[PDB]
Amino acid sequence: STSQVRQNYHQDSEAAINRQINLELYASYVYLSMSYYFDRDDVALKNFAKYFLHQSHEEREHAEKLMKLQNQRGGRIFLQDIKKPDCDDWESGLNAMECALHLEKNVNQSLLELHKLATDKNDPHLCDFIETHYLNEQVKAIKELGDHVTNLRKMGAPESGLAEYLFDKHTLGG
């Protein structure tokens, strides 16, 4: 039976929102894994660890907002397994930042495909939701990660452990 609230909400959009919820939860899990890598005693970069833990908690918030959207529009949430991150060892601060850049660009591509679907189904509320809450967040995240990668490369990372140490203090510390 049709939800009493549902209006102009295509079944393909509903399914795509469920896919996006899984992707945001996956991103949360990737950042959680990265964070505790930097907490290892043989890595020991505490501001890298705090930066990625914050990004993990952000992504959980991104997922919860999409779950709230699904219910606002009268769709039904269907959850899937959250796959483990492809990587147990992230190697260095520079490599983790490059992996985060690549993650945040795949999430953006998924959101752009979701916006194209919403446009094709003439769902301006969903278009505005994506634009307002997700697309500029992603552009800002990608720009920040690019900036971080550039600085770590210019400073001599990953071979310079002094580069990663000083970036941890001065950019992330900090």
Q: Which residues bind Cl ion (CB under 5 A)?
A: 6, 9-11, 80-81, 84, 86-87
Pick from 24, 123, 164, 168: which binds Fe ion (CB under 5 A)? 24
88 binds Au ion (CB under 5 A): no
Stretch 86-125 residues interacting with a copy of itself (CB under 8 A): 88, 101, 105, 108-109, 112, 115-116, 122, 124-125
CA torsion 141→147→89→40, rounded to 10°?
-100
**CA-to-CA distance for 142 and 146, rounded, in angstroms?**
6
Query: Do the Cβ atoms of 123 and 8 come closer than 8 Å?
Result: yes
Q: Would you say 159 is a known binding-site residue?
A: no
Q: At what angle do helices 161-170 and 136-155 cross, to 10 degrees?
A: 140
59 binds Fe ion (CB under 5 A): yes
Q: Would you say 104 is a known binding-site residue?
A: yes
Q: Which CB atom, from 80 or from 169, has the smaller least distance to Au ion?
A: 80
Pick from 11, 15, 91, 170: which binds a copy of itself (CB under 8 A)? 170
Min CB(103)–Mg ion separation in Å = 9
CA distances from 56 to 15, 26, 30, 62, 120 (A): 24, 10, 7, 10, 32
Q: What are phi and psi of 152, to 5 degrees?
A: -60, -40
- Stretch of 16-24, 39-47, 76-84, 97-105 lying at the interface with Au ion (CB under 5 A): 97-105
